[PDB]
Design a protein around this ligand. Structure first.
Ligand code: ZN
Ligand code: ZN
Ligand code: ZN
Ligand code: ZN
Ligand code: ZN
Ligand code: ZN
Lengths: 118, 118, 117, 117, 118, 117
């Protein structure tokens, strides 16, 4: 049987949805306190007792983090439609290359509402 | 690989357990601040960038919601034994017909205790 | 210096004096949070105003009266609003916990009430 | 006796008067929490200081002005810090809710601000 | 399709990591407010409407609980390297024998960081 | 107007002056929450009482003394109750943050302590 590990970051940005019908609240400029969850799966080095470091995880994420934190998302190439579904994937795509063990990504824009890409 | 989405509602009702041994706290009339989590899986329309709406999800749930919120659960046909296990299913059963993408239902009666039916 | 301790208990209530078919008038329930908070000086030796276990015991009677119960049944709780209810709690505990200074009650996660003094 | 009600709304803002390329000066956003809290006596009959639904309605105008909006656009919110912002809210509501006694605003989960009186 | 159930406990202990490079914050004596989640899967007795009791679950866990709560973890045989990965497993191992339905164990040492063994 | 900022740090402690084999006397630990809160007037131009980053820096020394450490080792923290501990923190920070008005410490999620003034 298997072990997975998981780490939460939060960040602050503004976004808007380009393709919502004209009235929709969601297409007005607005913002959120997003939460992101990286999750990794793999083996547990018998010496460190770790799937992986974390210092190493943080710093691998960080440049991707910094691009979103306290920023407007539609200006980031890839996120012209900054939906949770689109964003969760956008992350997977940036970090999967530098974190091979990336198992799944989760994005919550509100307390009460989220998204999990694999 | 695949994307799932998820939405939290909370509601207020009273319930009691019909079949607990005579002393049990749980068979006295009492109530809870329940939390319910609908989760859907499916594809991400390339134009909307959405698995589905939400306004559309909310309103599809709503009649089922309204029947539980600020109500006593044993009076609802189906919930004569308003356990989490029984309730989580009871929901699946009402909403799966109107939300084909329903992937799983979660019911938490306390902060610290829940149930996930699929 | 003030301390404060928090408890959830799980119960039912309806409000009797509410309009027509208003939804708080239908027998419902909530997961409630109660916060006793107390003010005194720390013992220069224990480093404590009270245990937190001295507290627990002194509450426990009132606590099991409410947890997993229906509130309207409880003399003094005909009409169990947050306001009635926090006050009622204060009346029960102030005798057994003289240092006690506030009682806070929350029905839901987002509403709540403080009965000070 | 005090009551308090809590609301999240979801919005964008940037701070105009901040150094160089400081990160709060880049157009960002937050999930905000607002807490109105009010002080009065309970009706000896309703058991209430106010509904919580009387409240909701009296706020609702100001609330939809902020939710899902950009704040700098809102006259009086050029410079939307927590401090500016809680005060601004107080100025809008104190007229419509005279019992109102504090306004608390939180940008993030861990920072926040109370504008009393 | 299937029902799983889940229960949260929290506990207080101190631990340190034996095998971190010399500076690391993590190898200094420190402690945490850990959270543990037992999760069970099985069938729902049609009379009780329960996968299982809980009173029965609690008390089956309890001796294992008591050994960790308000204790230093490196002194417990098995936990000489009290990492989340190692600890989550350590639990599985103690409770799986007395709770056959144990489906998965979760350990969170901070609000923002955890581990799920199966 | 008051602001408040929140920090978790992760540490160990035991209480020396506690009965027999009482469980707080066994070397344990907690995830602690510290809340500095401060009261002053907002700058009519910045819209701020303080940064939140001016704060962070002024705390940081005391903060890394506690985070990931054992508390009984720290002069003045023989006997690290919440009460001792919040006060101790106040004594360290009030010099570096004169506007500071409360310090709140929480051992667990449900207990806690405020050292005002
Ligand atoms: Zn949005
Ligand atoms: Zn129940
Ligand atoms: Zn109610
Ligand atoms: Zn900001
Ligand atoms: Zn640690
Ligand atoms: Zn302790």
């Amino acid at each position: 049987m298997s072990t997975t590990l998981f780490k939460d970051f939060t960040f602050e940005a503004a976004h808007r949805l380009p393709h919502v019908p004209e009235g929709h609240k969601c297409g007005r400029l607005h913002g959120h306190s997003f939460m992101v969850r990286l999750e990794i799966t793999g083996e547990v080095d018998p010496h460190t007792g770790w799937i992986i470091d974390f210092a190493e995880l943080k710093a691998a994420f960080k440049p991707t983090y910094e691009r979103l934190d306290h920023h407007y998302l539609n200006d980031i190439p890839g996120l012209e439609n900054p939906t949770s579904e689109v964003l969760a994937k956008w992350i997977w795509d940036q970090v999967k290359p530098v974190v091979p063990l990336l198992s799944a990504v989760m994005v919550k824009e509100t307390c009460t509402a989220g998204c999990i890409y694999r």
